[PDB]
Design a protein around this ligand. Structure first.
Ligand SMILES: CCCCCCCCCCCCCCCCCC(=O)OC[C@H](COP(=O)([O-])OCC(O)COP(=O)([O-])OC[C@@H](COC(=O)CCCCCCCCCCCCCCCCC)OC(=O)CCCCCCCCCCCCCCCCC)OC(=O)CCCCCCCCCCCCCCCCC
Ligand SMILES: CCCCCCCCCCCCCCCCCC(=O)OC[C@H](COP(=O)([O-])OCC(O)COP(=O)([O-])OC[C@@H](COC(=O)CCCCCCCCCCCCCCCCC)OC(=O)CCCCCCCCCCCCCCCCC)OC(=O)CCCCCCCCCCCCCCCCC
Ligand SMILES: CCCCCCCCCCCCCCCCCC(=O)OC[C@H](COP(=O)([O-])OCC(O)COP(=O)([O-])OC[C@@H](COC(=O)CCCCCCCCCCCCCCCCC)OC(=O)CCCCCCCCCCCCCCCCC)OC(=O)CCCCCCCCCCCCCCCCC
Ligand SMILES: CCCCCCCCCCCCCCCCCC(=O)OC[C@H](COP(=O)([O-])OCC(O)COP(=O)([O-])OC[C@@H](COC(=O)CCCCCCCCCCCCCCCCC)OC(=O)CCCCCCCCCCCCCCCCC)OC(=O)CCCCCCCCCCCCCCCCC
Ligand SMILES: CCCCCCCCCCCCCCCCCC(=O)OC[C@H](COP(=O)([O-])OCC(O)COP(=O)([O-])OC[C@@H](COC(=O)CCCCCCCCCCCCCCCCC)OC(=O)CCCCCCCCCCCCCCCCC)OC(=O)CCCCCCCCCCCCCCCCC
Ligand SMILES: CCCCCCCCCCCCCCCCCC(=O)OC[C@H](COP(=O)([O-])OCC[N+](C)(C)C)OC(=O)CCCCCCCCCCCCCCCCC
Ligand SMILES: CCCCCCCCCCCCCCCCCC(=O)OC[C@H](COP(=O)([O-])OCC[N+](C)(C)C)OC(=O)CCCCCCCCCCCCCCCCC
Lengths: 231, 105, 168, 114, 96, 52, 62, 135, 85, 103
């Protein structure tokens, strides 16, 4: 089975071509922390710690072109599938993990054995190591699950509220000419307030979710970075 | 977190000081060191060779998370049924009177 | 001769018509699996030997020197014996691309040669079979095409409870 | 530089004479390298000959140390002249590029012709 | 002619090979019935009997792929290991 | 200059694509069958009698 | 980023910029489509389908 | 030697389609190349008028597509299922009757979870046709 | 149900179907055509890359002796849990 | 001065980007693509009827049956398949004629 379909970004691609044929400065980035990993001067890393900047920027642009514009009615999030997001996070996370593993430095994993020598190795430290190795994969799964669930829940809530507002607006506006007009005006004002609140909440939540999505990947990278001190 | 420096040859405690599951496997019990997993873990921790405990675990998880998990899911053998459909070993043989083609020569 | 190109069609057909796989054909495939594992083992042993031989003297001293993890006494004796044996004579110890070639090319050649000739052996085995799979192999090498539905054309044997379809 | 048809004609015309010259240079350079290698193994420092290991402080990855894994043979003039060393260096460059091309040929069979 | 019973209730207590062969036989019977009707009507068979032929084809593909396991040392060991006396008793007790 | 020309042509192409997609292209697998394809099989064998 | 641009002070100024002219046209469409639905779907002569009980989406999704 | 790997190998003249390209760039640059048009990760511009123009346009073309391509399928399914189970049966009706049926479908959409449930649940004793009417 | 139906791609254009047998056979023919010529020896890494893994996987399939039944991958109906056929 | 992004053409830069900048990511992506097309590229007819149609499956015309009919007719005509062969019917041709005369 081969399905031929298209993304919902064609107009946005047209706008990108029109508005970015000439150069422009970028000064606001959703996830700026990918650019500033080191905060104490004289510290440097021999690992390619800035390799994630390009992927981070492209991912932010792609996910923003989809998620932020999805607030417009009838706009489609073409990639909104659980396993597709799993594939995306698998690519990024496993690629960086395999980059660290291909280094063939086993000492890098010494920190997985949690605790000190005082703690019993077999019954405490080894079980903590098992849990931490499990937690890495669980972090991957939780990242993709969080991204999927937030979008799904937000858009379900928006659709249901919009349906209710359409119903009351269309089939109960005649009460403005009736003696119970005050009740309808109260309900209508409440619906407008909830409409604005929901839109603001979704706008904030989309950007926050993208920030967290990139932060998880950068945290994976940072967990295995070692910094030398210049002398 | 911080940089790791391998211990010097003089900073590594003797093997006799390591403890097993029950107690130290000193003289007359040295060959039991090979079989006692906890003694090997304690020895590795003592020699700062903790990776021997951590590297096999993580990799195993990765191997399960990446390659074997799906292999078991898609191609693994489920539990056998109560009434089993064994092979009668009658299928495949050519019928009587059939003239097979000659082999290459 | 390239036996894999001929054998890929036959293997796919056997998978599609695996119902007619006699126990002899199954034993042939199990032997192929065993020989693949044996080839892997010997190639890995050769690779390890080449790696050890070309290893630097300091590397060997670190690897086969103190401390001893177990300190049983046999461990130290074996490590000292191997270290003395390796460091006694002169050894060509290349680095970089050179060590890659020396360690890998012999291993690749050995593994590939063994696997290729075992594939030829399996082709001969299937040629000598007196089953429908063997007949298909012979027809494939004769006409050059895989004849699907052959088992039901020549009426290959079926269980006593499934011969009704042949009843014509 | 970009490819051109004139250079293609030049290199196709001089392909076989070039290969023959490369083979002769290979013999000469092997002789020079053999002299240098014998001298290094005989008179070199223990660390240089034994190939002492120097690991990075962050990921403990081995790499050549300039102090220990490099050695200037001050008395090489007795066995090998300056011109021979220059010849060996030039041949090393040519041999590296030829080796990569030969590896591509062996890897891809006859599909490396284009 | 008579079609075999391949319903879920009948299929539940049946070996895979028997079920596959019965499905194949049912497909063949349906195909021959359709061909007989086409011949009686005089119309071409290809224009009427394509779907039944495809059903026979797919049932053949499912039937020829399955090879019942050979009863050998390792297979018998696995079967005996899983089906212990305790498990057999538990299976007998369960009404589902 | 190069990017200006390339983006001009890309913009025209995207404009045509957008118009076709959102105003001319029918959706596949319609319930009524009046618009769009229902799908079909490809890569079917041809001239291989021995295959059956 | 919502940094700047023309911002009409009141309704009457929306005609001082082409973009806001298009915006106010679109707002007119948005808000005026609701009264039209009120008139159309609360009409006296609107009649429910007699065969509405023959089939419903509730059957199909169940 | 066949194709250049460098972008500097030009395929056209510098003045090819200069005028149309300059008009296109003028359209692009007039509103976007401004100090207050600072974007957030290239996706959200700072100019208000870009929002004011693009939100309505995006909604308009998406709504046209939804009304004329996506919801039309559900509407046609309801018409076919409720009036014969075949397209010819629906076409036996007049345009006015089809209009009535489609507008009833719109009514059902607007109620959705809040409208009366007698639009799809037949009350006991109702004389209208049931589900087995055409069977 | 109806709200859930909003979450579908909106620009589906065409769907094509192909049997696994057919395109696998066509791919094998392409591979044989490109790996056949004499100027690609069997011991070359390219040829082994093309052939060895496929041979190994097919051998693993043939050697399989499972006590359970694996339903046909391309049945007409794979939605019924109580009917593997 | 020379830069990959400014001097190289797009295909060349694409290869360089995914070979000397993000080779592991490209490898993992190709791995996942192969997995998806090896295990997630099939849909049964029942699955299509349940979920494969926007408004639901139109049983009143049964497009799947028409699609399969076209497929099988094309295969039969192109491959010269004799669908009356005993293996397809399970009975001899003469028995088929007898059945035709009976029914
Ligand atoms: C049988 C029926 C037909 C179908 C056959 C199909 C055969 C299939 C074989 C089996 C394949 C199995 C696997 C399939 C997997 C599919 C997966 C999938 O879809 O994933 C979703 C995924 C969705 O991606 P997306 O996010 O939408 O972005 C991809 C878009 O293309 C947009 O992305 P982008 O913008 O980043 O792309 C770059 C873009 C950059 O932007 C542009 O260049 C702008 C233009 C964009 C064009 C592309 C968008 C298409 C929009 C819709 C169609 C437009 C209108 C078409 C009108 C048709 C009318 C009938 O540049 C281009 O597109 C380069 C091409 C430009 C062409 C320009 C042509 C100019 C001609 C001028 C002629 C003048 C003549 C004058 C003569 C005068 C004489 C006097 O699809 C893909 O990633 C691509 C899947 C493709 C898989 C390979 C398929 C095989 C190739 C088939 C070619 C058929 C050609 C014959 C057709 C003939 C007409 C019937
Ligand atoms: C450097 C990288 C670092 C970064 C890593 C990044 C990634 C994360 C890490 C984790 C991996 C993530 C997963 C990513 C996907 C990768 C692909 C994947 O997973 O595919 C698995 C995939 C799994 O197979 P499958 O497709 O699922 O099919 C399952 C079937 O079993 C397939 O059947 P088959 O026909 O293909 O045969 C397969 C066969 C493979 O094995 C063989 O063919 C035979 C053995 C091969 C040996 C290879 C050479 C080893 C060295 C030889 C000796 C050297 C020293 C010589 C000098 C000695 C002096 C005394 O295995 C078996 O069937 C099991 C046979 C076991 C027999 C056991 C008999 C009992 C006695 C022996 C054990 C007990 C001893 C007790 C002693 C007690 C003493 C007190 O492929 C395989 O595993 C098999 C094919 C590849 C085999 C390669 C063999 C070499 C492996 C490397 C060895 C050296 C490195 C390790 C040590 C390092 C130390 C520093
Ligand atoms: C189409 C062909 C397809 C080919 C397929 C095969 C794969 C690709 C072939 C080769 C491709 C070309 C490039 C390869 C990588 C190049 C790496 C490199 O640049 O190295 C430079 C480096 C030169 O630098 P150097 O300064 O001279 O020395 C390195 C420094 O020491 C460096 O100093 P350092 O400070 O970095 O020291 C650390 C260094 C120290 O190591 C070394 O550098 C020494 C050399 C490596 C020793 C490895 C052996 C270790 C002991 C193994 C013991 C196994 C016992 C098992 C017993 C089983 C009993 C039942 O590294 C390590 O510690 C890493 C140890 C390895 C860990 C392996 C972990 C694997 C986990 C497995 C996970 C699970 C897998 C799936 C499940 C399986 C089971 C079901 O080269 C080497 O040292 C040797 C390179 C060897 C290249 C590979 C040769 C390939 C031969 C292929 C034969 C088979 C062909 C099959 C074809 C099939 C049909 C198509
Ligand atoms: C038929 C089967 C084929 C198998 C498939 C092969 C597939 C292709 C892979 C590549 C194969 C090699 C291609 C030919 C290379 C040329 C010969 C050579 O080594 O040149 C020296 C040169 C040494 O490089 P280096 O960096 O200076 O080495 C550092 C050492 O410290 C250097 O040591 P040093 O500093 O002490 O100085 C020593 C130097 C001093 O010498 C000199 O100064 C005099 C010049 C000597 C070298 C001359 C080379 C000339 C190259 C051009 C040849 C003419 C081409 C003509 C083309 C047109 C023809 C019409 O002499 C050397 O260069 C000796 C190096 C060590 C020997 C390496 C050869 C080992 C393999 C051969 C034995 C195999 C036996 C099999 C037994 C089977 C048992 C079962 O080699 C290279 O340039 C390296 C190759 C570059 C391409 C690498 C491609 C990836 C390789 C991955 C292989 C992984 C394992 C295999 C499986 C792959 C599966 C994916
Ligand atoms: C010194 C000589 C002076 C001569 C003076 C002459 C003056 C008069 C003019 C001459 C006549 C006009 C010349 C051409 C002008 C073209 C337009 C233009 O000016 O563009 C600006 C520019 C002008 O050149 P330049 O700026 O001087 O230099 C460019 C730079 O050096 C390098 O550029 P770059 O690398 O930076 O970028 C190149 C390219 C990146 O590079 C490529 O794309 C090249 C590679 C693409 C390959 C794609 C196909 C791959 C297929 C798979 C592989 C197949 C293998 C098969 C193997 C064999 C099998 C047997 O970039 C892009 O893709 C972005 C631009 C795309 C343009 C938009 C295209 C769609 C416009 C649609 C408008 C109409 C809409 C419909 C209207 C309908 C009305 C009703 O041209 C380009 O950028 C070149 C674009 C080339 C795109 C090719 C796409 C082909 C797609 C269709 C393939 C059909 C295959 C059919 C097969 C059938 C089999 C059954
Ligand atoms: C950085 C933060 C940005 C915040 C931007 C805030 C924008 C504020 C908008 C105010 C209201 C706008 C009303 C528009 C009305 C259009 C016509 C209409 O009928 O629409 C009704 C539609 C739907 O209204 P409805 O649901 O009542 O429709 C009823 C229709 N029936 C009954 C048939 C169902 O209105 C909307 O959907 C507007 C929602 C806007 C939410 C904000 C989206 C911001 C993200 C996109 C930004 C795009 C910028 C692109 C710039 C270029 C990029 C390169
Ligand atoms: C309605 C049901 C819903 C169910 C939902 C279930 C979840 C689905 C989630 C899908 C999206 C997320 C996917 C993430 C990626 C998962 C990856 C995965 O598990 O794939 C494993 C699978 C395993 O492959 P396989 O399944 O073909 O395994 C073959 C094993 N036998 C033969 C025994 C059956 O990987 C692939 O599919 C890719 C294989 C080809 C690429 C790798 C080739 C090299 C292999 C190296 C080792 C062996 C050869 C020797 C060494 C090399 C010599 C040259």
């Amino acid at each position: 089975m081969f399905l031929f379909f298209f993304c919902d970004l064609f107009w946005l691609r047209l706008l990108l071509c029109m508005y970015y044929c000439v150069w422009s400065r970028l000064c606001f980035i959703v996830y700026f922390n990918c650019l500033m990993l080191i905060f104490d001067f004289l510290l440097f890393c021999l690992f390619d710690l800035y390799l994630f900047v390009g992927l981070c920027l492209f991912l932010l642009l792609w996910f923003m072109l989809f998620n932020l514009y999805s607030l417009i009615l009838y706009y489609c999030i073409t990639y909104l599938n659980l396993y597709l997001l799993f594939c995306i996070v698998f690519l990024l996370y496993i690629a960086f993990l395999f980059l660290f593993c291909f280094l063939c430095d086993f000492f890098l994993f010494n920190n997985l054995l949690v605790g000190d020598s005082f703690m019993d190795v077999f019954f405490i430290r080894f079980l903590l190591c098992f849990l931490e190795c499990f937690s890495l994969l669980c972090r991957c799964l939780s990242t993709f699950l969080r991204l999927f669930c937030n979008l799904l829940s937000s858009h379900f809530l928006l659709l249901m509220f919009f349906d209710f507002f359409y119903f009351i607006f269309v089939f109960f506006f005649y009460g403005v000419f009736c003696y119970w007009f005050i009740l309808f005006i109260f309900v209508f004002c409440f619906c407008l307030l909830f409409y604005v609140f929901l839109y603001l909440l979704d706008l904030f939540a989309a950007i926050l979710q993208l920030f967290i999505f990139c932060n998880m990947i950068l945290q994976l990278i940072m967990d295995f970075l070692l910094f030398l001190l210049f002398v | 977190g911080e940089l790791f420096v391998r211990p010097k040859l003089e900073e590594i405690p003797p093997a006799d000081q390591c403890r097993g599951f029950f107690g130290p496997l000193n003289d007359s019990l040295k060959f039991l060191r090979l079989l006692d997993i906890k003694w090997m873990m304690n020895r590795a921790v003592a020699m700062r060779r903790e990776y021997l405990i951590a590297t096999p675990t993580l990799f195993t998880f990765i191997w399960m998370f990446t390659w074997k998990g799906a292999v078991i899911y898609f191609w693994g053998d489920r539990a056998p049924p109560r009434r089993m459909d064994w092979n009668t070993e009658e299928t495949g043989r050519l019928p009587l009177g059939f003239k097979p083609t000659p082999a290459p020569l | 001769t390239k036996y894999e190109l001929k054998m890929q069609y036959f293997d796919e057909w056997m998978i599609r018509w695996r119902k007619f796989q006699t126990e002899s054909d199954w034993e042939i495939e199990k032997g192929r699996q065993w020989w693949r594992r044996f080839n892997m083992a010997v190639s890995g042993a050769l690779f390890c030997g080449l790696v050890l031989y070309t290893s630097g003297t300091a590397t060997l001293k670190r690897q086969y020197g103190l401390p001893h993890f177990f300190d049983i006494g046999v461990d130290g004796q074996a490590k000292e014996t191997m270290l003395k044996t390796l460091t006694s004579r002169w050894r060509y110890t290349p680095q970089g691309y050179g060590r890659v070639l020396i360690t890998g090319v012999p291993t690749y050649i050995l593994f590939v040669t063994l696997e290729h000739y075992r594939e030829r052996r399996r082709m001969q085995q299937y040629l000598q079979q007196n089953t429908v799979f063997g007949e298909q192999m012979r027809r494939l090498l004769s006409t050059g095409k895989i004849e699907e539905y052959l088992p039901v054309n020549i009426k290959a044997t079926l269980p006593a409870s499934q011969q009704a379809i042949y009843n014509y | 530089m970009q490819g051109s048809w004139s250079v293609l004609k030049k290199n196709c015309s001089n392909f076989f004479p070039g290969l023959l010259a490369f083979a002769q240079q290979t013999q000469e350079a092997y002789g020079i390298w053999l002299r240098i290698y014998n001298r290094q193994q005989k008179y070199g420092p223990t660390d240089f000959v034994e190939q002492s290991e120097t690991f990075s402080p962050d990921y403990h990855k081995r790499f050549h140390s300039q102090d220990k894994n490099m050695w200037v043979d001050k008395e090489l003039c007795t066995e090998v002249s300056q011109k021979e060393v220059a010849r060996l260096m030039t041949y090393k460059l040519d041999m590296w590029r030829m080796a990569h091309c030969a590896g591509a040929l062996l890897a891809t069979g006859g599909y490396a012709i284009p | 002619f008579h079609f075999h019973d391949v319903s879920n209730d009948a299929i539940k207590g049946m070996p895979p090979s028997e079920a596959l062969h019965k499905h194949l036989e049912n497909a063949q019977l349906a195909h021959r019935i359709c061909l007989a009707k086409a011949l009686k009507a005089g119309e071409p068979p290809v224009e009427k009997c394509a779907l039944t032929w495809g059903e026979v084809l797919i049932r053949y593909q499912a039937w020829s792929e399955y090879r019942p396991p050979f009863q050998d040392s390792v297979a018998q060991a696995k079967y005996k290991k899983y089906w212990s006396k305790k498990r057999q008793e538990e299976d007998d007790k369960n009404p589902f | 200059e190069i990017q200006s020309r390339k983006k001009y042509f890309q913009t025209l192409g995207y404009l045509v694509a957008f118009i076709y997609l959102y105003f001319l292209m029918p959706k596949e697998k319609s319930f009524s069958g009046l618009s769009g394809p229902d799908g079909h099989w490809i890569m079917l064998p041809k001239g291989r009698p021995e295959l059956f | 980023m919502l940094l700047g641009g023309f911002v009409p002070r009141r309704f009457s100024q929306f005609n001082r910029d082409p973009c806001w002219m298009f915006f106010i046209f679109s707002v007119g469409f948005w808000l005026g489509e609701y009264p039209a639905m009120m008139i159309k779907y609360n009409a006296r002569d609107l009649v429910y389908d007699p065969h509405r009980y023959v089939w419903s989406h509730h059957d199909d999704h169940h | 030697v066949l194709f250049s790997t460098y972008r500097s190998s030009r395929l056209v003249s510098k003045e090819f389609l200069h005028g149309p390209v300059m008009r296109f760039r003028a359209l692009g640059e007039y509103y976007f190349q401004r100090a207050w048009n600072g974007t957030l990760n290239w996706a959200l511009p700072g100019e208000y008028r870009l929002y004011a123009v693009m939100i309505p346009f995006i909604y308009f073309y998406h709504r046209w597509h939804n009304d004329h391509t996506l919801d039309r399928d559900h509407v046609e399914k309801a018409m076919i299922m409720r009036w014969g189970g075949t397209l010819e049966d629906v076409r036996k009706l007049s345009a006015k009757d089809q209009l009535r049926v489609r507008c009833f479908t719109d009514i059902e959409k607007l109620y959705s979870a809040y409208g009366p449930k007698d639009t799809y649940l037949q009350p006991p004793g109702d004389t209208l046709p049931g589900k087995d009417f055409y069977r | 149900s109806n709200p859930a139906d909003h979450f579908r791609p909106n620009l589906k254009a065409l769907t094509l179907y192909a049997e696994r047998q057919h395109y696998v056979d066509r791919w094998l023919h392409v591979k044989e055509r490109w790996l056949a010529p004499w100027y690609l020896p069997w011991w070359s890494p390219l040829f082994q890359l093309g052939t060895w893994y496929s041979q190994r996987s097919r051998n693993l399939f043939l050697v399989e002796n499972h006590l359970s039944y694996r339903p046909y991958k391309f049945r007409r109906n794979d939605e019924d849990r109580n009917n593997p056929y | 001065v020379y830069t990959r992004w400014k001097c190289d053409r797009l295909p060349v830069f694409q290869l360089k980007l995914f070979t000397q900048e993000y080779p592991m990511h490209a490898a993992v992506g190709i791995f996942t693509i192969i997995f998806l097309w090896k295990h997630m590229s099939h849909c049964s007819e029942e699955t299509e009827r349940k979920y494969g149609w926007w408004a639901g499956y139109p049983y009143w015309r049964d497009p799947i049956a028409r699609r399969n009919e076209t497929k099988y007719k094309q295969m039969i005509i192109n491959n010269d398949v004799d669908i009356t062969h005993p293996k397809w019917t399970g009975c001899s041709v003469e028995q088929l004629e007898e059945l035709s005369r009976v029914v």
